[PDB]
Scaffold this active site. Sequence first.
Site, PDB file in Angstrom:
ATOM      1  CE1 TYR A  40       0.956  -1.157   4.253  1.00 20.05           C
ATOM      2  CE2 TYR A  40      -0.527  -2.906   3.592  1.00 20.05           C
ATOM      3  CZ  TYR A  40       0.436  -2.416   4.443  1.00 20.05           C
ATOM      4  OH  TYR A  40       0.884  -3.192   5.486  1.00 20.05           O
ATOM      5  CG  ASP A  41       4.850   0.616  -0.113  1.00 20.26           C
ATOM      6  OD1 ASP A  41       4.489   0.093  -1.187  1.00 20.26           O
ATOM      7  OD2 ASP A  41       5.604   0.043   0.701  1.00 20.26           O
TER       8      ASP A  41
ATOM      9  CG  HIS B  75      -4.066  -6.401  -0.154  1.00 13.98           C
ATOM     10  ND1 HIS B  75      -5.256  -7.080  -0.009  1.00 13.98           N
ATOM     11  CD2 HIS B  75      -3.094  -7.344  -0.149  1.00 13.98           C
ATOM     12  CE1 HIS B  75      -5.015  -8.376   0.067  1.00 13.98           C
ATOM     13  NE2 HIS B  75      -3.711  -8.563  -0.015  1.00 13.98           N
TER      14      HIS B  75
END
Lengths: 612, 616, 116
Positions: free
Chosen positions: A109-110, A146
């Site tokens: 999620y970065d 995600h």
Amino acid sequence: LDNNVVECIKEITESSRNGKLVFFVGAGVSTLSDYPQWWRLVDKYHEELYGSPYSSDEYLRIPQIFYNVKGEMAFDGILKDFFQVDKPTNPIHDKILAMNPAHVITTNYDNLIDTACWKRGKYFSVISAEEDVANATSSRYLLKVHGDFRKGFKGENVVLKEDDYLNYDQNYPLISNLMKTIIATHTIVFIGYGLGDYNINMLLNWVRKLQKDSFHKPFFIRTDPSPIENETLIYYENKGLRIIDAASLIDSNEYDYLERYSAVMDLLIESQETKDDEVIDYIYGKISPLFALQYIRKIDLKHVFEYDYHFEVNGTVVRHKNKGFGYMERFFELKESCDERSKLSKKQYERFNALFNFFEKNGVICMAKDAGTLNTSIEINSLAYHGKYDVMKKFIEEQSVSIEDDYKKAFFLACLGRWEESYDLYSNIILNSGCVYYLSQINRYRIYQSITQAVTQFNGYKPFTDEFLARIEREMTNFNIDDLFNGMPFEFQKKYKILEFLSDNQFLYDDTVKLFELTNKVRSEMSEGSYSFGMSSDIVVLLRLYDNLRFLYENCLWSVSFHEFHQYIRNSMSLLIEKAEYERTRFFMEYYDFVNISRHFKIDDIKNLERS
Amino acid sequence: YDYHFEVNGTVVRHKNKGFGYMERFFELKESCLSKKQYERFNALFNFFEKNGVICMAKDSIEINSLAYHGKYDVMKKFIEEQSVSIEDDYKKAFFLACLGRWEESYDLYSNIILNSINGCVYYLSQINRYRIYQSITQAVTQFNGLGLLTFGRHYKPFTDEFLARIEREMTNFNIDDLFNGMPFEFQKKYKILEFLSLYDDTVKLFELTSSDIVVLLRLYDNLRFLYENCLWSVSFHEFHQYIRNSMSLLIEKAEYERTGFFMEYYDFVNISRHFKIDDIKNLERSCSIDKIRFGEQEKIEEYLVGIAEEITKQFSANGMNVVFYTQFISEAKAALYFAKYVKLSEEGLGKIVKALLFYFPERDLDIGKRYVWLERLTKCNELPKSIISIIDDFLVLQAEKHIDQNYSEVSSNGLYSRDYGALIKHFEKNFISKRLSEITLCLTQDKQKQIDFLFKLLPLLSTNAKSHLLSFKSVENINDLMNGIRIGLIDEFTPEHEELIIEYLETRKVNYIGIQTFSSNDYMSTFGIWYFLEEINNSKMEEFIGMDDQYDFFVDPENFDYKKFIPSWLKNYNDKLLGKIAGNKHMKHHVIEVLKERVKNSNDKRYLEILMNYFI
Amino acid sequence: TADVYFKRKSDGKLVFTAEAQTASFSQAISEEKLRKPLYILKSEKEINLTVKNAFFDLEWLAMTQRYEVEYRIYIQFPNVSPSGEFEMSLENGLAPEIKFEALADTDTDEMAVVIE
């Protein structure tokens, strides 16, 4: 690294060459560069709820409990202040970019992989939320299955808690479908994943649901310090996986992961982006298909080898764009020296004589360094060129032995002017059709053009009925030829690259420009009076002309009659005769040259040669 | 292809079959609708007119870029200016690359690529960034392979870190798939820029061998496309070849059709830049280019002076920029070669001549080639007294360097400092060199290379220097007598000089007798032609028949066996010789036979002149 | 297909080996008006040579970190200097062509010699 890893590496590099590969980026890669990993966050949540502090269920549950009791604002705030730390990328990102992946699936999620992608300059369509899949602005996807924080730092943008994992199917149906279809239609390389990861488990369950031999077994890169156990290797091999270990590949310490990631990934990228047997196997696949064509233009043999070695029209070859092994140099030493060629495998040697049968028939000899005296011996084994005008009638009425002869007799009708019947069975070959299908397709297009221009000539005699002219227009006006080469199997437009220029109307675009530079060069030699001790620019013009003429006649392309081709042939003989006249008063005539002057020159032009 | 937009700026429909929208537009453009479309109409207005699009078919292109005009100084202050916007960076890096500084351009083009987020500028930046990388490698290849051979020393303008850095990024980067790997909106909106990632117009050029107008006008369109758009591929060979073929063919066709055409200032740029010294020389031979009219002479004066200014600033201070040298020197030498046919002011003429002599590197134009460059300027522009001073002290400085015994001026063209002094004496006939005579007054036996150098420039020296120089000089070898003959010391063959020539003939007879070699000293020809001209009065060279050609041809022509006659022989003679050969009448039928064969076989048009002016 | 051997004048070291492609001997006169007295036979003789393939010796490029050229029965060319002109192509580049011209010295006044 004997057998069970080399297969994987050649498969991956082959997929990368085709452009069909996708890198399932894990969390180990993103944590390799410093980044607050999840278990820090969950133990921080525990320290918030309790005094002192881990199975996966607890990992999913502690944030779930904190969300349930403490609400939304506190969870959002702590996540935002713990995940706002921007970090520079690590070399593995630029490596995984340089591998050129078609799509990138990341469970992170970065905004780290995308930053490297932008720095390299490649443009990827980032997919984060549900709605972004519909508005895809490119054909290359960066799936974040995600979620991410791009829309904001609020918790629901990503999935961390237990109920988020429970309701993943009903909350992200489109993204899951995209992931499944990308896994199905590509090859998948897992990177930076622990073997006991939860995502890997669900994905393996799904691939267990599928039927046998309905997919390619994905490749999984493991990097844990312990060497791989045999038992787990069998267990995951029968689970539809093929696994590559960095622990067995090299030796290193347990507390450093950068070196072990780099070792396997550099082995992957560097290996073919050796011995003679690989060499002859290598060029066989690149040379075997062209046996369908009787003649090959030497100026196009560079495109066969992706512009590796420059082929000169005189039969000489010099290394042009080779940074690896000199494979074809080795092949010539197999040709000159029978000793090394004798020590080859039977199947390779059975291959070898085929190219030995090939490279002799196309005039290539050896290097330019090793070249000696070369004779300009050109033969045309084409009946139309020799003008045996009774013979093709004999060649036409005979029954067709195979589809190749069906194309040959089809062109004989076109040579005989009866292009109406020639078109009629031209559709039959397309019906009967697979390289000839492309050759049958365009010649059907070229032959239409000649009739249409002929129709205007006569009207502006009724050779063709209107219904034949009616049927020709319905099937053709929709047909476009620019997309014909693109509209082809991926293997065909990759294997048969030297056939791109027959599609476009300008079949001699390149050949005209290269001749003009020689033409002005030759006319430069006219005034300055400089002898050509080496292989003259005028000879290669004749060699080029003999090269292009042989391909068009032997391979039966309708371009043998077009005015652009006729003008191209006429202008080549005009200067070559011009040079010979000046050389004599400071080339000699042959039967082969007698055909072209008689065939492609107009009456007024012959006077021009006489006048000058 | 709905409306085929021809080059002249008019509109012809080609594929549009539905309602005519372009027809409606220009009608509203000509005549005098919502306000938001109004600003769209006005915005579309100026773009069409500025881009040369005016109106239909039924109802002079200039370039303003600091690189095109050769403003190597105006654009220098632009470099130091803080680039305001992203587009300002794009022109900056392109401008940075012209004055060498390829390393600086690589930095900037990298920055804009990561900066820009239209996105069109990201494309040309990517194309230009790749081109300079391709440019750098070829230059690096030249320097290590040919730069050592040409300049004599290794320069290595780029550090090993930089060249290792650049190859790390451009690897696995192809120009072909760059266009495909763009947002689909960008591909639709910019369906034109794929051809960048030259060849197209070259094919059309061959088909046309009006034709001249449709070829000439589109040439500026390409120039207004590459140069005006800060596209670095305008520094490559293929584009040079296209310009080379376009202009060379046009003048040949224009001269052929004339047997009219004139060229402007903009037509100076391409011939000076993309044409080499052989292209100009070949252009001279095929068609005479002095008949061409030269308009806009005001513009050419500022260009030639400005380009002559750059070499003076470059070569006179801290050597020179090797990166900038290769791109600029080739353009500089051709322009000076060009300047024969143009008329220049006295102040400008002194500027170009001073740069041509003093600050021009020797490795490019030696004393022979620099002389003909200088001599060509004398055709249109008569010699001014200030330029006479420039040639004056130029010879004086040359005399200073004639102290080292190893240093002797060497010229491929075959011309040396003597021809300079004759040229000044040609235009003055009274010039007395004070400086060279002063050195001749201080001339001793020590500087032997000085004695024979001022020998070649004897008329320029004063009478006092003439006596001083002549005391230490005597006729020793064969070259000494021709040195005295060239200046004008000898007007008649004294009995003593009759002995040196025959003794050399003995020498040439002695060394000729089992292995023979062929040279081009043209000394036998001078002896033989003198017998034909009766300057010599000694019949003793008749025993050297067969030593070489052009010797028995003028001593005993009646049995020369003219099968060995070279037709290029009549060219080397002068007006007096041609009349003598024609008037001798013992071989006129033979010469008129060799004179007539060349006029029909070749179009040199000079054998035509020799055939005509004297009917030899 | 003549072979070119380019060496320094000072030593016998081969600068490089090439393949001769073109040679021009187009000598001609200069402008007559700008240049009764004894005949001089003024001329603007020039000789140029061009090779399409070149290869520099390893020792020369190692040590380099007036010339003489002889091409092959075989013909020499003393006092030869190159024309270091470079131009780059959009296509990657591969035949390095080298052009050189023979200088004429004032003392000897000869540019070309050929032995058999």
